[PDB]
Amino acid sequence: MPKNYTLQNASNLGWLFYKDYYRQEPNVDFISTQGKESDTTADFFRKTNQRITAYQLNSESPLVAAFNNHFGTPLQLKTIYPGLITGSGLPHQTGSKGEFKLGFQFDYTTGLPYIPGSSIKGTLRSMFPFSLKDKGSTKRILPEYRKERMEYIRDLIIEVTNINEISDTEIQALEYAIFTNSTPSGKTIEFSLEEKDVFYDAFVADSKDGVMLSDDYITPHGENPLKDPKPILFLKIRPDVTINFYFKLCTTHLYKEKVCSSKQIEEIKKQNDFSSSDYKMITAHQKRNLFEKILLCIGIGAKTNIGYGQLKKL
Amino acid sequence: MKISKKQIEYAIEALRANNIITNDNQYPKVFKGYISSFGAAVIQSGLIPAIIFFENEDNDANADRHKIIGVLKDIINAMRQQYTVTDATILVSSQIPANYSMAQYIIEHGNTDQLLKEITEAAVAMKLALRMYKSE
Amino acid sequence: MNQLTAILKQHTPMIHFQHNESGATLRASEVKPLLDKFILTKLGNGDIREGRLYAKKNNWLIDNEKNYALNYKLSISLQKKSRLEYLITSSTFPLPTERPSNFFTIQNSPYFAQEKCVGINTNSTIILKKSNSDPRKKEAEFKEKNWSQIDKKGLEWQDFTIKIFSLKGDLINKIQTYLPAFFICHNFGTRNNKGFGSFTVEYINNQKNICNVEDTLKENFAFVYKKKIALSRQSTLDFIYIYNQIFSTIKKDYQILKSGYNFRNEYIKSLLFCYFVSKYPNYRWEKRKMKQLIKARGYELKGDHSPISGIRENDNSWNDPNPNGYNYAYIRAILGLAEQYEFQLETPYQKAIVKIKSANNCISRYKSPLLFKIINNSIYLVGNEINTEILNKPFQYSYIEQTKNKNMRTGKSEITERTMHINEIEMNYKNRINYHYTPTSFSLIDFMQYAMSYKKNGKNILNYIPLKQ
């Protein structure tokens, strides 16, 4: 009940955080100004937060085991302490004392903290040169953006795979194949079912000895240092917590700076004028290593600039 | 959910009556975000938390956020004024008191689906009505 | 270069509110906003507007419109997770002879929050009870359960790494130049202005940093003074013996400028009070009129000596000279705003409390403008000019009498609060020079000159070397 989440004795963490958080109880008032600042409201929210922050996750969790069976072998990385925040922009605020002011990303069914696959895909793509859209507003920073990111991608690819030299067009084609599953343009490559890159949801895997959710403060001091600060309390994923990243990655075949299908590359290999110098191959394992390096570099979640969401190898 | 033209009319008169829309058909640019955030808060946290948050008058906000809750109350009152006799047997057709706190009204009347549906429809109507005017 | 790695060494134990986690270290949500302001200030050659224009020019800003934030990623992590936990109090107490090996105490420190952590109640971390056999000389007992549920702990870690990431190479190289200077000029944590969060940079990307602490403080601060601590022998207990002297000295030295020292037969006048008597307005601190007003009612205050007037050796007087009343002002506000004044009536188990409010809600707080820095066991007192907004602002005082009644046989508690009917000075009295208003003119550089050049009998009361005035 209080710890060891499981599936038989637990309260849905998202339910507790969003729907059951502001339940109306006798003698508890937070409609009036006096009620929102009262100690009774603070005690009520303290008890709710203590209920939220009391659950642990075992390594042999049937939930996590089912996730592993469905989505394959995970990439296990461990949280370091600033904490980890996801879904910070979700509205969760009334104006009371002792309540969680920022939002949190909970799975609806399981209730476990998780990172949506869209978040992981966007975070990984942001470190690739062609993530920024060529637009009127972005055209000022567009050249520097791609110039800076292309070098980073080049060194990372040379590190993770045996390719000695990679061109800018090759990097563009690889990025558009991994994330867009197309060519740099609008053209579609005839890909097989397994030749698709899928970014599943990252789930909290195992809190070894301790809870997985903790409370943290950000206390902005305004532009006037003579005025009072503003304590903002939010919910974070505790440090030393294992995060399971699930991917479905394939092998990318590059021939003459263009992305080729597996059968296409077989036919190209069978031809007489096959230049092995123009053939490049990045496997699923090397793609996973590339993504792992990106994640260890920048991290994932909210407030990543001020440290939150940084990962270490398990 | 389809927003009727009468609901948008009610929203226009409610935004003029409180004081969102100035006499020159302009409104402060922050009320757009206020209404969008109220809709998001209703969909995510719940009706009562969102109503309590946006009903608060002792804010640090740039403008008067509670006027959007006032517009909500006026739109709901106008909607209930046109409830049919057979609707009043199933739905509550009583008028919300002007000085009554909306959050405590909802709490005392429960959390019924009628109030939540009315609030969501009125919030969408407010958004559509603001989209018809200029952001200062 | 895209990554910047720095190794930080700790000089004073940081007061951390999240000590429960084993990876608890310096928080980057604190370092980054200050580092951004430091770099923008340095880029503009002391002006933050020119520095923002510089950052705006070379696309270094996250937003070009409304914030000082620079586009880099900051992470602070611990390499070895072995830490020393300190109990930092403003009250001396006997050491309990049963403690964890990493548990240490700083008996006399400027940090005066968490005073209830040592005392009588069962919630105290260290509990004092009257020792058997001989009276007095109580002994202390350590409760680990209360140690766990403490809001803030003094934490000192071994060398730990700071990671700065930015895809802009020129931003990283400018950060490298200013990073050693930033940490020398700043403290982090609770009560940082008294020297509780001092850090220095040792290795920048595996390169030993040679940054002279004296000149780094010279360029950034208006006045810098150096204090020679006693180089006592037995320098093997580096932590406790040295730390206790330094923080006791800081509390000693700071409670000379602000208020005075009153313990045994040793009295040093408030240097801030002495400063304003010397100048033309001849301001007298609000404490003088607080005591006079309370005596004007049927409340008698504990003290063998009358309130001090002027600077001369013995002017302990209760009444103003003759032609008219003294000129009074809130002198102690400029060195830190307080909330309550406790006066501790002679009649036991009851005291008078004076509450300070801004007389219109504009000034809620004021950080002390003096910064104490501790690097390599050397005490540097640095600072700049004060915020001019505090000058000449009103303050209402609420006089309430509190009686800590002799229990009720069950709970050992009191709730008594009574409003003393003090005849309050009008706000516009003496053309807004009453005792409600902060002083009109004040310069810190002038004050630190007068304060640390002050002398009675012989030598300096604040034994400091004036590196920069």
mmCIF file with all atom_site columns, C-alpha atoms in Angstrom, chain B:
data_model
loop_
_atom_site.group_PDB
_atom_site.id
_atom_site.type_symbol
_atom_site.label_atom_id
_atom_site.label_alt_id
_atom_site.label_comp_id
_atom_site.label_asym_id
_atom_site.label_entity_id
_atom_site.label_seq_id
_atom_site.pdbx_PDB_ins_code
_atom_site.Cartn_x
_atom_site.Cartn_y
_atom_site.Cartn_z
_atom_site.occupancy
_atom_site.B_iso_or_equiv
_atom_site.pdbx_formal_charge
_atom_site.auth_seq_id
_atom_site.auth_comp_id
_atom_site.auth_asym_id
_atom_site.auth_atom_id
_atom_site.pdbx_PDB_model_num
ATOM 1   C CA . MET B 1 1   ? -19.237 19.686 -29.215 1.00 0.00 ? 1   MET B CA 1
ATOM 2   C CA . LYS B 1 2   ? -20.572 22.405 -31.521 1.00 0.00 ? 2   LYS B CA 1
ATOM 3   C CA . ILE B 1 3   ? -20.673 25.992 -30.264 1.00 0.00 ? 3   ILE B CA 1
ATOM 4   C CA . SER B 1 4   ? -23.929 27.742 -31.110 1.00 0.00 ? 4   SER B CA 1
ATOM 5   C CA . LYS B 1 5   ? -24.080 31.320 -32.347 1.00 0.00 ? 5   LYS B CA 1
ATOM 6   C CA . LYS B 1 6   ? -26.223 32.262 -29.344 1.00 0.00 ? 6   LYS B CA 1
ATOM 7   C CA . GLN B 1 7   ? -23.440 31.086 -27.027 1.00 0.00 ? 7   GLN B CA 1
ATOM 8   C CA . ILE B 1 8   ? -20.980 33.320 -28.884 1.00 0.00 ? 8   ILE B CA 1
ATOM 9   C CA . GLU B 1 9   ? -23.445 36.207 -28.578 1.00 0.00 ? 9   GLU B CA 1
ATOM 10  C CA . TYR B 1 10  ? -23.666 35.553 -24.831 1.00 0.00 ? 10  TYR B CA 1
ATOM 11  C CA . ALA B 1 11  ? -19.868 35.499 -24.660 1.00 0.00 ? 11  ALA B CA 1
ATOM 12  C CA . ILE B 1 12  ? -19.640 38.838 -26.482 1.00 0.00 ? 12  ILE B CA 1
ATOM 13  C CA . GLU B 1 13  ? -22.115 40.549 -24.155 1.00 0.00 ? 13  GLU B CA 1
ATOM 14  C CA . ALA B 1 14  ? -20.443 38.987 -21.103 1.00 0.00 ? 14  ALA B CA 1
ATOM 15  C CA . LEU B 1 15  ? -16.981 40.149 -22.185 1.00 0.00 ? 15  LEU B CA 1
ATOM 16  C CA . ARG B 1 16  ? -18.354 43.653 -22.734 1.00 0.00 ? 16  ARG B CA 1
ATOM 17  C CA . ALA B 1 17  ? -20.348 43.660 -19.486 1.00 0.00 ? 17  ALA B CA 1
ATOM 18  C CA . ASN B 1 18  ? -17.460 42.698 -17.204 1.00 0.00 ? 18  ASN B CA 1
ATOM 19  C CA . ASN B 1 19  ? -14.880 44.863 -19.071 1.00 0.00 ? 19  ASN B CA 1
ATOM 20  C CA . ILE B 1 20  ? -12.715 42.584 -21.208 1.00 0.00 ? 20  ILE B CA 1
ATOM 21  C CA . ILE B 1 21  ? -13.667 44.392 -24.432 1.00 0.00 ? 21  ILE B CA 1
ATOM 22  C CA . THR B 1 22  ? -13.132 48.146 -24.439 1.00 0.00 ? 22  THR B CA 1
ATOM 23  C CA . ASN B 1 23  ? -15.508 50.573 -26.134 1.00 0.00 ? 23  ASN B CA 1
ATOM 24  C CA . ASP B 1 24  ? -13.206 50.553 -29.191 1.00 0.00 ? 24  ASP B CA 1
ATOM 25  C CA . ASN B 1 25  ? -13.530 46.753 -29.614 1.00 0.00 ? 25  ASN B CA 1
ATOM 26  C CA . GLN B 1 26  ? -10.107 45.997 -28.120 1.00 0.00 ? 26  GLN B CA 1
ATOM 27  C CA . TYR B 1 27  ? -8.971  43.806 -25.236 1.00 0.00 ? 27  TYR B CA 1
ATOM 28  C CA . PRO B 1 28  ? -5.704  43.330 -23.328 1.00 0.00 ? 28  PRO B CA 1
ATOM 29  C CA . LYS B 1 29  ? -3.563  40.703 -25.031 1.00 0.00 ? 29  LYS B CA 1
ATOM 30  C CA . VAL B 1 30  ? -3.115  38.581 -21.886 1.00 0.00 ? 30  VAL B CA 1
ATOM 31  C CA . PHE B 1 31  ? -6.769  37.487 -21.617 1.00 0.00 ? 31  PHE B CA 1
ATOM 32  C CA . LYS B 1 32  ? -6.218  35.231 -24.638 1.00 0.00 ? 32  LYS B CA 1
ATOM 33  C CA . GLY B 1 33  ? -3.653  33.273 -22.645 1.00 0.00 ? 33  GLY B CA 1
ATOM 34  C CA . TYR B 1 34  ? -5.897  33.475 -19.584 1.00 0.00 ? 34  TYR B CA 1
ATOM 35  C CA . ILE B 1 35  ? -8.779  31.733 -21.364 1.00 0.00 ? 35  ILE B CA 1
ATOM 36  C CA . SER B 1 36  ? -6.538  29.178 -23.087 1.00 0.00 ? 36  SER B CA 1
ATOM 37  C CA . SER B 1 37  ? -4.878  28.339 -19.760 1.00 0.00 ? 37  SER B CA 1
ATOM 38  C CA . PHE B 1 38  ? -8.278  28.049 -18.081 1.00 0.00 ? 38  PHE B CA 1
ATOM 39  C CA . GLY B 1 39  ? -9.381  25.537 -20.704 1.00 0.00 ? 39  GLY B CA 1
ATOM 40  C CA . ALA B 1 40  ? -6.164  23.560 -20.272 1.00 0.00 ? 40  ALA B CA 1
ATOM 41  C CA . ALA B 1 41  ? -6.507  23.626 -16.472 1.00 0.00 ? 41  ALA B CA 1
ATOM 42  C CA . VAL B 1 42  ? -10.113 22.424 -16.663 1.00 0.00 ? 42  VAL B CA 1
ATOM 43  C CA . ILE B 1 43  ? -9.136  19.561 -18.960 1.00 0.00 ? 43  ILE B CA 1
ATOM 44  C CA . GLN B 1 44  ? -6.087  18.553 -16.882 1.00 0.00 ? 44  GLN B CA 1
ATOM 45  C CA . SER B 1 45  ? -6.455  19.322 -13.168 1.00 0.00 ? 45  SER B CA 1
ATOM 46  C CA . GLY B 1 46  ? -10.250 19.510 -12.949 1.00 0.00 ? 46  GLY B CA 1
ATOM 47  C CA . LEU B 1 47  ? -13.125 21.948 -12.781 1.00 0.00 ? 47  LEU B CA 1
ATOM 48  C CA . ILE B 1 48  ? -12.759 22.934 -9.120  1.00 0.00 ? 48  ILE B CA 1
ATOM 49  C CA . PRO B 1 49  ? -8.961  23.555 -9.146  1.00 0.00 ? 49  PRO B CA 1
ATOM 50  C CA . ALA B 1 50  ? -9.146  25.669 -12.308 1.00 0.00 ? 50  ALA B CA 1
ATOM 51  C CA . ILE B 1 51  ? -12.121 27.674 -11.036 1.00 0.00 ? 51  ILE B CA 1
ATOM 52  C CA . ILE B 1 52  ? -10.352 28.280 -7.720  1.00 0.00 ? 52  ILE B CA 1
ATOM 53  C CA . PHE B 1 53  ? -7.117  29.335 -9.435  1.00 0.00 ? 53  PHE B CA 1
ATOM 54  C CA . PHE B 1 54  ? -8.700  31.763 -11.886 1.00 0.00 ? 54  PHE B CA 1
ATOM 55  C CA . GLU B 1 55  ? -11.282 33.040 -9.374  1.00 0.00 ? 55  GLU B CA 1
ATOM 56  C CA . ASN B 1 56  ? -8.556  34.296 -7.015  1.00 0.00 ? 56  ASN B CA 1
ATOM 57  C CA . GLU B 1 57  ? -8.431  38.087 -6.786  1.00 0.00 ? 57  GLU B CA 1
ATOM 58  C CA . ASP B 1 58  ? -5.197  38.468 -4.770  1.00 0.00 ? 58  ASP B CA 1
ATOM 59  C CA . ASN B 1 59  ? -3.052  37.669 -7.794  1.00 0.00 ? 59  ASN B CA 1
ATOM 60  C CA . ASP B 1 60  ? 0.334   38.789 -9.057  1.00 0.00 ? 60  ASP B CA 1
ATOM 61  C CA . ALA B 1 61  ? -1.048  38.698 -12.605 1.00 0.00 ? 61  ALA B CA 1
ATOM 62  C CA . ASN B 1 62  ? -0.792  41.645 -14.976 1.00 0.00 ? 62  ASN B CA 1
ATOM 63  C CA . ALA B 1 63  ? -4.568  42.016 -15.421 1.00 0.00 ? 63  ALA B CA 1
ATOM 64  C CA . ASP B 1 64  ? -7.804  40.989 -13.677 1.00 0.00 ? 64  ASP B CA 1
ATOM 65  C CA . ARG B 1 65  ? -8.026  37.227 -14.187 1.00 0.00 ? 65  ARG B CA 1
ATOM 66  C CA . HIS B 1 66  ? -11.215 36.884 -12.115 1.00 0.00 ? 66  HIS B CA 1
ATOM 67  C CA . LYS B 1 67  ? -13.117 38.774 -14.813 1.00 0.00 ? 67  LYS B CA 1
ATOM 68  C CA . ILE B 1 68  ? -12.903 35.649 -16.982 1.00 0.00 ? 68  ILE B CA 1
ATOM 69  C CA . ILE B 1 69  ? -14.703 33.733 -14.214 1.00 0.00 ? 69  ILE B CA 1
ATOM 70  C CA . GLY B 1 70  ? -17.245 36.549 -14.132 1.00 0.00 ? 70  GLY B CA 1
ATOM 71  C CA . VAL B 1 71  ? -17.717 36.185 -17.893 1.00 0.00 ? 71  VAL B CA 1
ATOM 72  C CA . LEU B 1 72  ? -18.127 32.437 -17.329 1.00 0.00 ? 72  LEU B CA 1
ATOM 73  C CA . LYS B 1 73  ? -20.869 33.068 -14.771 1.00 0.00 ? 73  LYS B CA 1
ATOM 74  C CA . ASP B 1 74  ? -22.672 35.516 -17.064 1.00 0.00 ? 74  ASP B CA 1
ATOM 75  C CA . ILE B 1 75  ? -22.524 33.118 -20.030 1.00 0.00 ? 75  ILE B CA 1
ATOM 76  C CA . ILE B 1 76  ? -23.825 30.249 -17.896 1.00 0.00 ? 76  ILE B CA 1
ATOM 77  C CA . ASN B 1 77  ? -26.657 32.444 -16.601 1.00 0.00 ? 77  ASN B CA 1
ATOM 78  C CA . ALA B 1 78  ? -27.604 33.444 -20.152 1.00 0.00 ? 78  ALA B CA 1
ATOM 79  C CA . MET B 1 79  ? -27.495 29.790 -21.231 1.00 0.00 ? 79  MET B CA 1
ATOM 80  C CA . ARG B 1 80  ? -29.724 28.746 -18.323 1.00 0.00 ? 80  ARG B CA 1
ATOM 81  C CA . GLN B 1 81  ? -32.191 31.559 -19.059 1.00 0.00 ? 81  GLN B CA 1
ATOM 82  C CA . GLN B 1 82  ? -33.129 29.782 -22.310 1.00 0.00 ? 82  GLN B CA 1
ATOM 83  C CA . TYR B 1 83  ? -33.516 26.306 -20.803 1.00 0.00 ? 83  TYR B CA 1
ATOM 84  C CA . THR B 1 84  ? -36.778 24.674 -21.850 1.00 0.00 ? 84  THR B CA 1
ATOM 85  C CA . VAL B 1 85  ? -39.360 23.397 -19.351 1.00 0.00 ? 85  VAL B CA 1
ATOM 86  C CA . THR B 1 86  ? -38.498 19.774 -20.133 1.00 0.00 ? 86  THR B CA 1
ATOM 87  C CA . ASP B 1 87  ? -34.819 20.707 -19.776 1.00 0.00 ? 87  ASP B CA 1
ATOM 88  C CA . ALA B 1 88  ? -35.417 22.164 -16.302 1.00 0.00 ? 88  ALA B CA 1
ATOM 89  C CA . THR B 1 89  ? -36.762 18.808 -15.092 1.00 0.00 ? 89  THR B CA 1
ATOM 90  C CA . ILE B 1 90  ? -33.438 17.136 -15.935 1.00 0.00 ? 90  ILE B CA 1
ATOM 91  C CA . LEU B 1 91  ? -31.053 20.111 -15.760 1.00 0.00 ? 91  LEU B CA 1
ATOM 92  C CA . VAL B 1 92  ? -30.720 22.769 -13.068 1.00 0.00 ? 92  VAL B CA 1
ATOM 93  C CA . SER B 1 93  ? -32.135 25.999 -14.508 1.00 0.00 ? 93  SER B CA 1
ATOM 94  C CA . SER B 1 94  ? -31.613 28.150 -11.406 1.00 0.00 ? 94  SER B CA 1
ATOM 95  C CA . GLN B 1 95  ? -29.634 31.347 -11.921 1.00 0.00 ? 95  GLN B CA 1
ATOM 96  C CA . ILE B 1 96  ? -26.234 31.596 -10.244 1.00 0.00 ? 96  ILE B CA 1
ATOM 97  C CA . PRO B 1 97  ? -26.263 34.515 -7.765  1.00 0.00 ? 97  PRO B CA 1
ATOM 98  C CA . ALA B 1 98  ? -24.170 37.446 -8.949  1.00 0.00 ? 98  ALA B CA 1
ATOM 99  C CA . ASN B 1 99  ? -22.163 37.864 -5.736  1.00 0.00 ? 99  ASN B CA 1
ATOM 100 C CA . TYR B 1 100 ? -21.823 34.110 -5.179  1.00 0.00 ? 100 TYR B CA 1
ATOM 101 C CA . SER B 1 101 ? -18.397 32.518 -5.435  1.00 0.00 ? 101 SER B CA 1
ATOM 102 C CA . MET B 1 102 ? -18.428 30.220 -8.453  1.00 0.00 ? 102 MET B CA 1
ATOM 103 C CA . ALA B 1 103 ? -16.179 27.583 -6.871  1.00 0.00 ? 103 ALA B CA 1
ATOM 104 C CA . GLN B 1 104 ? -18.351 27.304 -3.769  1.00 0.00 ? 104 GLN B CA 1
ATOM 105 C CA . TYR B 1 105 ? -21.464 27.205 -5.969  1.00 0.00 ? 105 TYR B CA 1
ATOM 106 C CA . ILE B 1 106 ? -20.017 24.250 -7.875  1.00 0.00 ? 106 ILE B CA 1
ATOM 107 C CA . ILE B 1 107 ? -18.959 22.539 -4.635  1.00 0.00 ? 107 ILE B CA 1
ATOM 108 C CA . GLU B 1 108 ? -22.369 22.981 -2.998  1.00 0.00 ? 108 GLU B CA 1
ATOM 109 C CA . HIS B 1 109 ? -24.070 21.714 -6.159  1.00 0.00 ? 109 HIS B CA 1
ATOM 110 C CA . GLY B 1 110 ? -21.572 18.838 -6.326  1.00 0.00 ? 110 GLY B CA 1
ATOM 111 C CA . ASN B 1 111 ? -19.416 18.169 -9.361  1.00 0.00 ? 111 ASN B CA 1
ATOM 112 C CA . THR B 1 112 ? -22.210 17.261 -11.764 1.00 0.00 ? 112 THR B CA 1
ATOM 113 C CA . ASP B 1 113 ? -21.512 16.746 -15.454 1.00 0.00 ? 113 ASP B CA 1
ATOM 114 C CA . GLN B 1 114 ? -23.924 19.582 -16.272 1.00 0.00 ? 114 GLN B CA 1
ATOM 115 C CA . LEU B 1 115 ? -21.734 22.232 -14.643 1.00 0.00 ? 115 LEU B CA 1
ATOM 116 C CA . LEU B 1 116 ? -18.514 20.888 -16.181 1.00 0.00 ? 116 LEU B CA 1
ATOM 117 C CA . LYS B 1 117 ? -20.085 20.693 -19.645 1.00 0.00 ? 117 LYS B CA 1
ATOM 118 C CA . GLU B 1 118 ? -21.464 24.225 -19.324 1.00 0.00 ? 118 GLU B CA 1
ATOM 119 C CA . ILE B 1 119 ? -18.073 25.534 -18.188 1.00 0.00 ? 119 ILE B CA 1
ATOM 120 C CA . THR B 1 120 ? -16.252 23.861 -21.085 1.00 0.00 ? 120 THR B CA 1
ATOM 121 C CA . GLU B 1 121 ? -18.743 25.135 -23.670 1.00 0.00 ? 121 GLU B CA 1
ATOM 122 C CA . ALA B 1 122 ? -18.613 28.650 -22.214 1.00 0.00 ? 122 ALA B CA 1
ATOM 123 C CA . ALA B 1 123 ? -14.799 28.631 -22.193 1.00 0.00 ? 123 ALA B CA 1
ATOM 124 C CA . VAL B 1 124 ? -14.732 27.626 -25.865 1.00 0.00 ? 124 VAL B CA 1
ATOM 125 C CA . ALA B 1 125 ? -17.291 30.359 -26.570 1.00 0.00 ? 125 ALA B CA 1
ATOM 126 C CA . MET B 1 126 ? -15.102 32.904 -24.764 1.00 0.00 ? 126 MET B CA 1
ATOM 127 C CA . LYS B 1 127 ? -12.086 31.864 -26.828 1.00 0.00 ? 127 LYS B CA 1
ATOM 128 C CA . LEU B 1 128 ? -14.073 32.190 -30.057 1.00 0.00 ? 128 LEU B CA 1
ATOM 129 C CA . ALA B 1 129 ? -15.436 35.585 -28.990 1.00 0.00 ? 129 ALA B CA 1
ATOM 130 C CA . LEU B 1 130 ? -11.960 36.919 -28.195 1.00 0.00 ? 130 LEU B CA 1
ATOM 131 C CA . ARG B 1 131 ? -10.779 35.661 -31.585 1.00 0.00 ? 131 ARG B CA 1
ATOM 132 C CA . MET B 1 132 ? -13.233 38.140 -33.174 1.00 0.00 ? 132 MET B CA 1
ATOM 133 C CA . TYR B 1 133 ? -11.527 41.237 -31.710 1.00 0.00 ? 133 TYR B CA 1
ATOM 134 C CA . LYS B 1 134 ? -8.098  42.858 -31.763 1.00 0.00 ? 134 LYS B CA 1
ATOM 135 C CA . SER B 1 135 ? -5.436  42.160 -29.125 1.00 0.00 ? 135 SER B CA 1
ATOM 136 C CA . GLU B 1 136 ? -4.830  45.818 -28.264 1.00 0.00 ? 136 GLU B CA 1
#
